[PDB]
Design a protein around this ligand. Structure first.
Ligand code: R80
Length: 133
């Protein structure tokens, strides 16, 4: 029951500062433009200890499955090869990606009827708000 309130299909309804976040991460111009246009659906499911998060968009479909606290290798939508660990901290899913001596953190939180995604790279934060599909 660890992630019950996250489970479901979620659609992006607003974004702030995502271009800047992508710049800070090192994403190039053409990928930023196409990726920034996307309105993904985020599909979260749980089977036993295994959490699966899919992102489906016109840019790039991704899928990760993981156990909390157990590092895994992830190829991101922008084609970074990262080492990821996802933990629950006070009811927030905290997803850390490490690559090339860099780190970024994506937090997913349930707030009211929304799922709020906060993406941080150094001093740059992007906030993306999803609603149930
Ligand atoms: C971080 C993030 C938040 C989200 O809510 N949806 S998303 O856009 O698929 N995404 C992954 C991502 C997509 C594209 C790029 Cl270019 C980068 Cl760096 C990351």
């Amino acid at each position: 029951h660890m992630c019950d309130a996250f489970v479901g299909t979620w659609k992006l309804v607003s974004s702030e500062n995502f271009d800047d976040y992508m710049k800070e991460v090192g994403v190039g111009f053409a990928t930023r433009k196409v990726a920034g246009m996307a309105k993904p659906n985020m599909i979260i499911s749980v089977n036993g200890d295994v959490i699966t998060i899919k992102s489906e968009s016109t840019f790039k479909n991704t899928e990760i499955s993981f156990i909390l606290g157990q590092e895994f290798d992830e190829v991101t939508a922008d084609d970074r090869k990262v080492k990821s660990t996802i933990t629950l901290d006070g009811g927030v899913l905290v997803h850390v990606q490490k690559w090339d001596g860099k780190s970024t953190t994506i937090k997913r939180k349930r707030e009211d009827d929304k799922l709020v995604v906060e993406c941080v790279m150094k001093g740059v934060t992007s906030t993306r708000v999803y609603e149930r599909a």
